[PDB]
């Protein structure tokens, strides 16, 4: 489980139709956590 609240699970559910692109979402969502654009 690794607990809840993560860019992974978030990007996974958002891309349920195409989980193969989740990486692109996680990479951006994760990076620049201090206050990215």
CA angle 25, 2, 13 (to 5 degrees): 35
Type and span of the H or E element at 9:
helix 7-14
All structural domains of the chain with their residue ranges: 1-37
Cα separation of 17 and 35, whole Å?
A: 28
SS3 of residue 36 by DSSP: coil
CA angle 37, 24, 22 (to 5 degrees): 120
User: Cβ–Cβ contacts within 10 Å for residue 22, how many?
Assistant: 20
Q: How was this one solved? A: NMR
């Amino acid at each position: 489980g690794s607990g809840r609240g993560s860019c992974r699970s978030q990007c996974m559910r958002r891309h349920e139709d195409e989980p193969w692109r989740v990486q692109e979402c996680v990479s951006q969502c994760r990076r620049r956590r201090g206050g990215g654009d």
